[model samples]
Target: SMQEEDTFRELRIFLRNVTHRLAIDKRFRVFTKPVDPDEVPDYRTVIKEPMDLSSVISKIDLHKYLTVKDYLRDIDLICSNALEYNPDRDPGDRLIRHRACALRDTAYAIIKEELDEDFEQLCEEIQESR
Candidate 1:
């Protein structure tokens, strides 16, 4: 439980950092419409203080599900299931390939609505930030 909490904290912090930087990244705007002002609230305070995963999700109005944990659970299950769908021929390479494909499919499914060229460019920019 503590390990999961740590991971959740790290994930929340990392996303906060990415979102703050992405708010300024020209790659998003150069290719797409400027972000709405209402969508930028978290940038200013993202790194000012540390918060729990629920707090982070609440701050961002990310209520795709009633709770953030449920959303994460969905992702975990979907990605893990996708990865385990078929074993790779090479055992050593399975982790890498499975992880890549799983994440790709998981992201695509979740972000399907925003899969347009402009939004995808933003996604690409976010991925590049990694």
Candidate 2:
């Protein structure tokens, strides 16, 4: 369990790293849209502070999943299932991530519109898998 929590922590860190570096290093604006660095919330705090969630920031009960280790250990399974569904291997995973991140922010904004409640309930809903 501890290992999974650690892995989740690591994954969070990795995602945060990707978020910040990608925000600064890439030209997502031309393909996506303009985003001020200040407008982006720090990934670590987004889950705790929903009022702060922006377009690019994602939130979740990182601990809700069984464990980060198992979650990651299942990567191959995900890839296998994904490959089954779409055999085409897009060499643009990096681009896709950015696109997904852009859509992710938009989704966050949309969710915020309907659920104007405490952010914890949002996490609870996600964990409930409903």
Candidate 3:
């Protein structure tokens, strides 16, 4: 039963989780205006707390948080440039994109079960592709 429906809630939470994990890394940072030492700014400063996930996504405009256009090229810029400061492994665009997709599927499965909704049949397609 995969009739087209609003994917907002699922996507929003998915991005939230993705951004949160990215922010956890010292690399994928979001720089913003005016210094605010009062808060724990990530490398860029937009992300200060766990609740800043939405703001981070909106700022980065990843996977259409504000627009319908999918500017995946930005992912390349982010993975190559922004993450250059990471002390650990540098996460490339491909890696990030795959992680995002994987986590979104995982989140939807859990969400559907918790909310007593039907599991998305796309999961079968995904498994077949694997």
Which number leads on lDDT?
1
Q: What lDDT tens digits, residue by residue, belong to model 2 across residues 1-130?
A: 4643464465455444433443453444322232234665452242321121222334323332332323222222322322333334576554545444453454345334633344334434444563
> Could you give me the TM-score of model 1 versus the true structure?
0.26
A best-first ranking of the candidates according to their TM-score comes to 3, 2, 1
lDDT value for model 3: 0.39
Per-residue alpha-carbon lDDT of model 1 for 29-129, expressed as tens digits? 22122223377664234233222233434554452332233434543543344344334677744654555354435434544543244533543344445
On lDDT, who's better, 2 or 3?
Answer: 3
TM-score of 2: 0.29
Query: Per-residue alpha-carbon lDDT of model 3 for 40-67, expressed as tens digits?
Result: 3564543232223334467543434421
lDDT of 3 at 54: 38
Index of the highest-TM-score prediction: 3
Q: List candidate 1 segments past 4 Å from native.
A: 27-130
Q: Give lDDT per model, in order.
A: 0.40, 0.37, 0.39
